[PDB]
Amino acid sequence: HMKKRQLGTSDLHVSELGFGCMSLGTDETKARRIMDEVLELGINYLDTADLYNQGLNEQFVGKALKGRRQDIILATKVSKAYIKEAVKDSLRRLQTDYIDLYQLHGGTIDDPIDETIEAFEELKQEGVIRYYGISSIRPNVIKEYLKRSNIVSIMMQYSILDRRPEEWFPLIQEHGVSVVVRGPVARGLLSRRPLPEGEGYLNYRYDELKLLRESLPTDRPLHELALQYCLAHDVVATVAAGASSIDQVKANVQAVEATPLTAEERQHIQKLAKAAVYEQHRE
Ligand SMILES: OC[C@H]1O[C@@](CO)(O[C@H]2O[C@H](CO)[C@@H](O)[C@H](O)[C@H]2O)[C@@H](O)[C@@H]1O
Ligand code: NA
């Protein structure tokens, strides 16, 4: 019942919900129980990289991979020497010999871009990684890697409340690249938790958040609307929703497996929600 999408033009076919951004805890036995359940749910994409300051314990993930490596798409994150030495450390902890998707974090336009690209290409030629991508909300970085590199994915914060990525979707898609979503529920603001009084989100004030929760369609839970809004864009290959329990993972799976938005439902959310753009790092 978990559908998959092609990650860019790569050979990786990733579950629409990916797993990351959940603590596996201190007990290895409990951690492996959590991972077994994740995989049992049909999630096959595991990103160990920090998302919102929460990553996955690589030693624990490594033990969960045992006997089924080929069935899992493993992503991690990281001048040529640094990029090479870094993935070696992850592989040792993960007890495997290749990463499916190796992603650059912290890229800027002032980095040594040719050197960086060459590092990833050499790792890919040698089979240490299968593909590479970036994690970025900087259009100037995105444009450079799309023009100059063979990235297959860009990880971006994206939700009903942060539509800044959408400006770049046509460009990304024209290059045959996919987006991997973080923050699809806006860190809880698109769920059942209260809106903290007086606090906003990006260019929303508190009162605008309150109003938008009320005005959005009420025929689906807000959490489901949020995940299905992300998925309603073909450029999106997978969404990495946050979870701090197996119950929360199952809730995410159920919402991703619900009926997709129609064209109409999508156009409706598009009208109701703000459509902001990135102010910084555009060029
Ligand atoms: O120029 C006003 C115009 O901007 C929007 C963009 O969504 O709202 C922004 O500006 C308001 C006035 O400063 C703020 O109250 C609001 O929080 C902010 O997003 C539009 O709603 C508005 O028409
Ligand atoms: Na534009």
Automatic annotation (TrEMBL):
<feature type="binding site">
    <location>
        <position position="185"/>
    </location>
    <ligand>
        <name>NADPH</name>
    </ligand>
</feature>
<feature type="binding site">
    <location>
        <position position="22"/>
    </location>
    <ligand>
        <name>NADPH</name>
    </ligand>
</feature>
<dbReference type="InterPro" id="IPR020471">
    <property type="entry name" value="AKR"/>
</dbReference>
<protein>
    <submittedName>
        <fullName>Oxidoreductase</fullName>
    </submittedName>
</protein>
<feature type="binding site">
    <location>
        <position position="183"/>
    </location>
    <ligand>
        <name>NADPH</name>
    </ligand>
</feature>
<feature type="binding site">
    <location>
        <position position="187"/>
    </location>
    <ligand>
        <name>NADPH</name>
    </ligand>
</feature>
<feature type="binding site">
    <location>
        <position position="252"/>
    </location>
    <ligand>
        <name>NADPH</name>
    </ligand>
</feature>
<feature type="domain" description="NADP-dependent oxidoreductase">
    <location>
        <begin position="16"/>
        <end position="273"/>
    </location>
</feature>
<dbReference type="GO" id="GO:0016491">
    <property type="term" value="F:oxidoreductase activity"/>
</dbReference>
<keyword id="KW-0547">Nucleotide-binding</keyword>
<dbReference type="GO" id="GO:0000166">
    <property type="term" value="F:nucleotide binding"/>
</dbReference>
<dbReference type="Pfam" id="PF00248">
    <property type="entry name" value="Aldo_ket_red"/>
</dbReference>
<dbReference type="InterPro" id="IPR036812">
    <property type="entry name" value="NAD(P)_OxRdtase_dom_sf"/>
</dbReference>
<feature type="binding site">
    <location>
        <position position="193"/>
    </location>
    <ligand>
        <name>NADPH</name>
    </ligand>
</feature>
<feature type="binding site">
    <location>
        <position position="244"/>
    </location>
    <ligand>
        <name>NADPH</name>
    </ligand>
</feature>
<dbReference type="InterPro" id="IPR023210">
    <property type="entry name" value="NADP_OxRdtase_dom"/>
</dbReference>
<feature type="binding site">
    <location>
        <position position="242"/>
    </location>
    <ligand>
        <name>NADPH</name>
    </ligand>
</feature>
<dbReference type="InterPro" id="IPR053135">
    <property type="entry name" value="AKR2_Oxidoreductase"/>
</dbReference>
<feature type="binding site">
    <location>
        <position position="135"/>
    </location>
    <ligand>
        <name>NADPH</name>
    </ligand>
</feature>
<feature type="binding site">
    <location>
        <position position="248"/>
    </location>
    <ligand>
        <name>NADPH</name>
    </ligand>
</feature>
<feature type="binding site">
    <location>
        <position position="47"/>
    </location>
    <ligand>
        <name>NADPH</name>
    </ligand>
</feature>
